[PDB]
Design a protein around this ligand. Structure first.
Ligand SMILES: [Zn+2]
Ligand SMILES: [Zn+2]
Ligand SMILES: [Zn+2]
Length: 178
């Protein structure tokens, strides 16, 4: 197994996947690494299993259809993985914890959002459809763009949103387009 966490790329107290060489800190994995379970399979392995059991699940889909899906176990897992893929980028640090807004010439967003809040929301099964999760994720970056205006810091939002959007298209097998 790897000797660094797959998400944050640091050593420490790591849990090792039994079906692939990845390792995780307890609260870096999403959901948090389970108490017992020997063997244990990580979320990357669990996602690959879904695909393997239903090869047709990788044919293209319309975003509009994906968003209206109910958060049954498999969609819950896909949203967990997509959230994890965002945390995998080191630039997610800017969006993890609760922000605050005091900048000359800007007003804070009406509805603040951050990755740890989305994490909690998923953990507490507060989303009923994929749309719920995707709207909150997109809101994070949209709030950032709006608040930072012409400061070049706005680009961190563009960057992290691109990681989100690419992973969304991949994980939910959105139909490729020009
Ligand atoms: Zn970690
Ligand atoms: Zn694994
Ligand atoms: Zn089948």
């Amino acid at each position: 197994n790897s000797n660094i966490c797959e998400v944050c790329n640091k050593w420490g107290r790591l849990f090792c996947c039994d079906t692939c060489p990845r390792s995780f800190h307890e609260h870096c994995h999403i959901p948090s690494v389970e108490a017992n379970k020997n063997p244990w399979s990580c979320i990357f392995c669990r996602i690959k299993t879904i695909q393997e059991r239903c090869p047709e699940s990788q044919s293209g889909h319309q975003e509009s259809e994906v968003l209206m899906r109910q958060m049954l176990p498999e969609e819950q897992l896909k949203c967990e993985f997509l959230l994890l893929k965002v945390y995998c980028d080191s630039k997610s640090c800017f969006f993890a914890s609760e922000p605050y807004y005091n900048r000359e010439g800007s007003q804070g967003p009406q509805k603040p959002m951050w990755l740890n809040k989305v994490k909690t929301s998923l953990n507490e099964q507060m989303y009923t459809r994929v749309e719920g999760f995707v709207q909150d994720m997109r809101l994070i970056f949209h709030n950032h763009k709006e608040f930072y205006r012409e400061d070049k810091f706005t680009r961190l939002g563009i960057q992290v949103q691109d990681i989100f959007e690419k992973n969304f298209r991949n994980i939910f097998a959105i139909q490729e387009t020009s």
